[PDB]
Design a protein around this ligand. Structure first.
Ligand SMILES: Nc1ncnc2c1ncn2[C@@H]1O[C@H](COP(=O)(O)OP(=O)(O)OP(=O)(O)O)[C@@H](O)[C@H]1O
Ligand SMILES: Nc1ncnc2c1ncn2[C@@H]1O[C@H](COP(=O)(O)OP(=O)(O)OP(=O)(O)O)[C@@H](O)[C@H]1O
Ligand SMILES: Nc1ncnc2c1ncn2[C@@H]1O[C@H](COP(=O)(O)OP(=O)(O)OP(=O)(O)O)[C@@H](O)[C@H]1O
Ligand SMILES: Nc1ncnc2c1ncn2[C@@H]1O[C@H](COP(=O)(O)OP(=O)(O)OP(=O)(O)O)[C@@H](O)[C@H]1O
Ligand SMILES: Nc1ncnc2c1ncn2[C@@H]1O[C@H](COP(=O)(O)OP(=O)(O)OP(=O)(O)O)[C@@H](O)[C@H]1O
Ligand SMILES: Nc1ncnc2c1ncn2[C@@H]1O[C@H](COP(=O)(O)OP(=O)(O)OP(=O)(O)O)[C@@H](O)[C@H]1O
Ligand SMILES: [Mg+2]
Ligand SMILES: [Mg+2]
Ligand SMILES: [Mg+2]
Ligand SMILES: [Mg+2]
Ligand SMILES: [Mg+2]
Ligand SMILES: [Mg+2]
Lengths: 226, 226, 226, 226, 226, 226
C-alpha cells in the first residue's frame, strides 16, 4: 500500500512517464553523451521547482563558470541572475583555478543549511572521479557521496557523461548500480538524422514507464511526449 | 532414481520452469544488469519462504541500508519491519561506513545459528570482490564462500551484476563456473521497448526448462509465464 | 593402412561421429561454456567404460567435492558410490582447502598404478592454470601434463571452460593447439531458445565427421544424433 | 528573449545550419578523420572573416610550417602571404625543431594584444596532448586552454583528429565534453565511394540544425548545402 | 622475362593455383587455426618431394614427438619410419623436456649439411616465439631465421597458428610481412557445417591465383580443386 | 590560380585519378595490408621515373636484401641491376645484420647528393618505428623524417603496413595525419574472391578523385582503371 513519496519536477511530460517524478530524498543519476541535454535537464528541474513550489535549490558545477550557466539559462528565457541575487538559488563553484571529497560535501551541506534548499543538481561528478583511475575508488566515492546526500535529505540529480550511445551507462560502468536511480539520455544517429530519446531503466521502490520516449529541446525547455 | 531435493520458492511460475525450484543447500547465482530485478527476486524469495513455509531467512546487503530495503518492500505491500521485529527475518549490515571475508562468513554463520534460518540471500558480493582486481582471487574467494555456505546448509541466492545484456554472466567471467547454479536476468532493448526475460542456463544435478521466459514486475511481485 | 587404435566411449551416437571414439592413449580436450555438459560428458565416459569394458577409471576434480559428484551422478541413476567403494572407480581430491603440478601428476600416476585404471577424466585444469597469468606458462604446463599422460598411457578427457560461444576454444586461446584432440560443446541462443550442439574440430591422425551435431541431455545420459 | 551573440563565419551554407554561425567568444571544437577538411575549415573561417569583417586573426599550427599553409591557401586562390606581410593575419609557429602550455598561451595572448585579433584557429592541440597519456591530464589541460581563451575573448576554432568515422569525437573521448561546442566532420565510405558530411551535435546556449549535411570541397572553398 | 624458379610440391591441385608451386629457396609461411591441416600440409610436401624428386627433407618439430608424427603419417599410408631409417628423411627434436635460436639454426644447418637435404618444414615457430612477449622481438627473430634459411638455400615451409578465422594472419600480426610468402588455411563454420578453404595472399616476385579454393582432406592426402 | 606543381609517376591510370600524380617535394604515404602491392608500387614509381624522365632515384629498404629486390623486379621484366651498375639507381641497405634515425637520414642525404637523385622510396619505416612502442615517439620521428625529406627536396613515397583492411591507415593510427599525403591500398575478401582497390583519401593543397578504383597487377606493372 504505502509507497515512496515523489516530488513533481514540472518537466513537460516527464512526470507522466516517471509516475510522479523523482523520489523525494534519493539521488538520481542522469547519463548521456555530449549534446543530449543533461545540464539543461538539471537546470530546468531546479528552475521549475523554484518557480512552482518555491523550493530553493543548489546547483553544483565543476566545468562551467556560473556566468556561463546564467547566460545559457537566459538563452531559454530563464533569469537565474535574479534568483541568485534574491538568494532563492545558489550556484556552487568548484572548478579548478586555471592559474578532497570531504570539503566538497561539507560545502554543499553548508549551502543547504544556509539557503534552506531541498533540491540539488550536479553538473558532473565524473570530473572529480577522473582523479582516481581505479573503478573501486570510483564506486567507493560515489557511494559515500550518495549516502551523504541521503543523510542530508536533498533531492539530488547527479549527471555523468557516457562515451557510447549503446553500452555502459557511465564511463566506468560502476555508476549504474551505486546510484539509487538512473536515467539514460540518448542522442543516436539513424539515416543521417539525430533523434533524441529519453528512457528510465530503474526507479528503486516504485513503478515507472519503460522504453525510449522521444523528447525535443525547444526554446522554452524540454518537451517530452509520454 | 534418486534426485536432489528441492524447495519451492513460491514465485509465480518460476517453480514450473525450474522443475521444483532451487535445490536445497546449494548456492544459486542470479546475474542481471541494472534494473532487471535481482534484489527484488531475492527479497521475494525470502518473503515468500517466510510467509508460506515459516522458514526464517537472513538477507545480507552491502550497498543498501536496511531502511531502504524495508521501504522498497513496503512499496510492494511486504511488511518486512514486522518480520524483523518479531525475529523471523534478519537483515545483516555490511556496508562501508560513509564517515576480511572470514569476519563476514563468521557473522552470517552466527546469524544462522541465532535465528535458526535456512534461507540466505546476498544483495551483491561483487562489492566485496571489487577489492581484489585479479580474477584468480575472485574465483578463490567465491569458491570459499560457496563452500562455507554449503557446509552451513542454508539455501543461498547470491546476486551479482553484469555489464552487457549478452555476453559474460558476470563482471569478471569466472562467477559463472564456480557457483553451483546460475540464473540470468536480461533487460534487453528492441524497437525502443524494453522486454524482460528470465532464463536458467544450468542447474547441476537436476533438470530444468531452457530458454528465455518473459517475466513482468507487478505491484504484488514477479509474475513469470512458464 | 594402419591407423590409430580407438576405444569406444559408449556414448549414444558419439562413436558414429567420431569414427570409433576417442583414440587410445591420447589426451582429448573438451571445451564448452557453462551449462554445456562437459563434466557430465566426462562422467558418462568414465561410467560407460566401467560398466561395459570393466576398465577402471580415475576422475580428477578441482572445484567440486566428491560428494557433489556422487549426488549429481545419482541424479541420472548412476551409483558411483558403489563403484568407489568396490575400488573400481577412484575420485581424486585436489580442491583448495576453504579453511605444484609435479605433485598432482605424481598423485595421478600413483592412483593409476594402484587401481590399474586406463581411463582418466579431469574436471578443469583451468583452475590450476589460473595461478599463472602468462599464456606461455599455460602452454608449457599443459604440454607437460599432456606428455606425462601420454607416457602413462591412460586415455584422458581434459575439460576446460570457454567464455564466448563463438571464438576461442579456451579462455587463453593456446589450449586448442597443445592438446592432441579438441571437442567443442556449444550452448547457443537463437530466437529466445537454447539449442545444444556438439562438434569435433580435429582428431589428429584419424578421420572424423565435421560440423555441429545436436545433442540432448536426458535423464539417462547424453543422447547425440549422428 | 536574450540570446548568445553570434559572428558569421561567411562559409557557404554553414551559417544557415548553425543559425548565425559560431558564438562570439566561445571555443569551438572541430573533429574529423584525416582528409575531412578541418584545417581547410579553420583557414577558410579566418580568411573569410579577414576579408569580410576586416577582423584580424591568429592561426596557431603545430605540425605544418607556415610556408606549407601559405602554399595550400594559394592553391585555393587565397593570398595569405599578402595578409601576413600587411600584419592583418599572423601565423604562430610552435612545431618541434627537427634538429609547457603556459608559454604557448602566453604567446597567443601576446599575439592577440599585438595584432588586435578577435579570431583564433588551432591546427591541432592533439599534438600537444600526446605528451600526456592520461585522459585526466588531457581534460585538465584542455579545460585550462579553453578557460584562458574565454578570458582573452577571442573566438577559437580548435581542431582535433579522430580515429574512427563513427564513435568517439576525439582520440581520447574527453574532448567532446570540455569544449564549449563540437562540430563533427565525417568522411565515410559507402559502396566504394566517399561522401563528405558535416554535422553539429551541440551548441551550448543556442539552437542549431541537427543531422548530417553534405559538403563538397571546391577550388573556392567549402560549399555546404543546408 | 626471367622469373623466380619454382619447385613442384606435388600436392594435388596446389601447383595449378600456385603457378608452379613454392619458389625455390624462399621461406613460405602457412597460417591456419587448429584443425585446418598445417602439419599435414608440411608433411605431405616433404613426403611428396622425397618420393618424386628424391630430394631429402628435414622436418623440425617443437610440440610433437617424432613417434606421434610417424603414427599420424602411417595413418595416411605414409611410411616415414622407413625413410628415417634409410636416412632419406630426418626429423629434428626440439620439444622441451617434460621432466637460444642460435643453437636451433646451427642444428638445422648441421642436419642440412649431413643429410644433403633441400627441403625444410617447421611444425611451429610460435612455440619458440612465445618466450618473448614483445612483437618487436618476434619480428627480429623471425627475420633472422628467414635470412638464415635463405642463406642456407633450403625451401622452408614454416607453419604458425592463428586465433581467428578472419583477421590477423598470425597470433601477433607481424609474421605476415616478414615471411617471403604467406598461405592462409581457413576452417570456417557456416550453417552448422565446416568447409575448408585454401588461399594464397602473396607470392613475392611471381604470379599466383587469388581467392579461396576449397580443399578436402582424404585418406591419401590433401585434394585441392583449382 | 597557382597550384602545387606535380610530377607524373607514369603508372597506368594513376595520374588520371591523382590529377597529375604525386606533388613535387612532398612525402607520400602508401598504406596497405600484406600482398596489396606497396613495394611494387614504389619500385614501379622509381623505375618509370628513371626510364621516362631520366631522373635518378634512391630506394631505401629495411627488410629485403638488394638482391631480392633485383630478382623481384627482373620478374616483371625490369632490369634494375643495369641501372644500379650504371649509377642511375641506388639501393640503400639498412637491414639488421643477421649475425639512430640521424644516421639513416644523413646516409639518405649523402646518397641524394652523390647520385643527384630527385625521387626517394622507402620499403618500410614501420620496421624502424617498432623500436619505440609509444605513439608519441612514432609521431615525433615520422614528423622529423618528413621534415628532413622536405628540406632535402626529394619526392618521397614512404610505404607502411596496416593490420585491418578497414580501419586505421597504419599500425599506430598516427601516421595518417603526420604524412603530407596518404594513399590506401586495400586487398579485401568478398564471396571467396579477392578484389584489389586503390583509393586516395587526401592530397593536401590539390584536388584528387575520391573513392575505390580497382587495380590489377600484371606482368608489366600495375594497371589502374580511372
Ligand atoms: N535555446 C535553445 N533552443 C534549442 N536547443 C537548445 C537551446 N540551448 C541549447 N540547446 C541545445 O542544447 C544542446 C546541448 O546543450 P546542453 O546545455 O544540454 O549541454 P549538455 O549536453 O548537458 O553538455 P555536456 O555533454 O558538455 O555536459 C545542444 O544540442 C542544443 O541543441
Ligand atoms: N512497486 C513496483 N511496481 C513495479 N515495478 C517496480 C516496483 N518497485 C520496483 N519496481 C521495478 O524494480 C526495478 C528495479 O528495482 P530492483 O529493486 O529490482 O533493483 P535491481 O535491479 O535489483 O538493482 P541493482 O542493479 O542496483 O542491484 C525497476 O525497473 C522498477 O520498474
Ligand atoms: N538429470 C538431468 N536431466 C537433464 N538434464 C540434466 C540433468 N542433470 C543435469 N542436467 C543438465 O546439466 C547441465 C549442466 O550440468 P553439468 O554437470 O553438465 O555442468 P557443466 O556444464 O559441466 O558445468 P561447468 O561449466 O560448471 O563445468 C544443466 O544445463 C542441466 O540441464
Ligand atoms: N584546391 C582544392 N580543391 C579541392 N579539394 C582540395 C583542394 N585542396 C585541398 N583539397 C582537399 O583537401 C582534403 C584534405 O586537405 P586539408 O587541408 O583539409 O587536410 P585535413 O583533413 O585538415 O588534414 P589532417 O587530417 O592532416 O589535419 C583532400 O581530401 C583534398 O581533396
Ligand atoms: N586419415 C585421415 N583422413 C582424413 N582426415 C584426416 C586424417 N588424418 C587426419 N585428418 C584430419 O586432420 C585434421 C587435423 O590434423 P592435422 O595433423 O592437420 O593437424 P593441424 O591442424 O596441423 O594441428 P595444429 O593446429 O595442432 O598444429 C583433422 O581435422 C582431421 O580431420
Ligand atoms: N610478375 C607478377 N605478376 C603478377 N603479380 C605479381 C607478380 N610479381 C608479384 N606479384 C604480386 O605481388 C603481390 C605482392 O608482392 P609485392 O612485392 O607487391 O609485396 P608487398 O605487398 O609490397 O609486400 P609486404 O606487405 O611484405 O611489404 C602478390 O600478391 C603477387 O600476386
Ligand atoms: Mg554540463
Ligand atoms: Mg541490489
Ligand atoms: Mg565441472
Ligand atoms: Mg591540419
Ligand atoms: Mg602441428
Ligand atoms: Mg616491402
Amino acid at each position: 500500500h504505502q509507497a515512496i513519496a515523489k516530488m513533481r519536477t514540472m518537466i513537460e511530460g516527464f512526470d507522466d512517464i516517471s509516475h510522479g517524478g523523482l523520489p523525494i530524498g534519493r539521488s538520481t543519476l542522469v547519463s548521456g553523451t555530449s549534446g543530449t541535454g543533461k545540464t539543461l535537464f538539471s537546470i530546468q528541474f531546479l528552475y521549475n521547482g523554484i518557480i512552482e513550489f518555491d523550493e530553493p535549490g543548489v546547483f553544483v558545477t565543476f566545468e562551467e563558470t556560473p556566468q556561463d550557466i546564467i547566460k545559457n539559462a537566459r538563452s531559454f528565457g530563464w533569469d537565474l541572475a535574479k534568483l541568485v541575487d534574491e538568494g532563492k538559488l545558489f550556484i556552487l563553484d568548484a572548478s579548478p583555478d586555471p592559474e578532497d571529497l570531504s570539503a566538497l560535501i561539507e560545502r554543499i551541506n553548508y549551502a543547504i543549511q544556509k539557503y534552506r534548499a531541498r533540491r540539488v543538481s550536479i553538473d558532473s561528478v565524473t570530473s572529480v572521479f577522473q582523479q582516481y583511475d581505479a573503478s573501486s575508488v570510483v564506486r567507493r566515492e560515489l557511494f559515500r557521496l550518495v549516502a551523504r546526500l541521503k543523510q542530508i535529505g536533498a533531492t539530488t540529480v547527479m549527471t555523468t557523461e557516457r562515451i557510447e550511445e549503446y553500452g555502459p551507462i557511465a564511463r566506468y560502468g560502476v555508476e549504474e548500480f551505486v546510484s539509487d536511480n538512473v536515467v539514460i539520455l540518448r542522442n543516436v544517429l539513424e539515416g543521417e538524422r539525430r533523434r533524441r530519446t529519453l528512457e528510465i531503466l530503474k526507479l528503486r521502490g516504485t513503478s515507472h514507464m519503460k522504453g525510449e520516449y522521444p523528447f525535443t529541446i525547444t526554446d522554452h525547455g524540454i518537451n517530452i511526449f509520454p
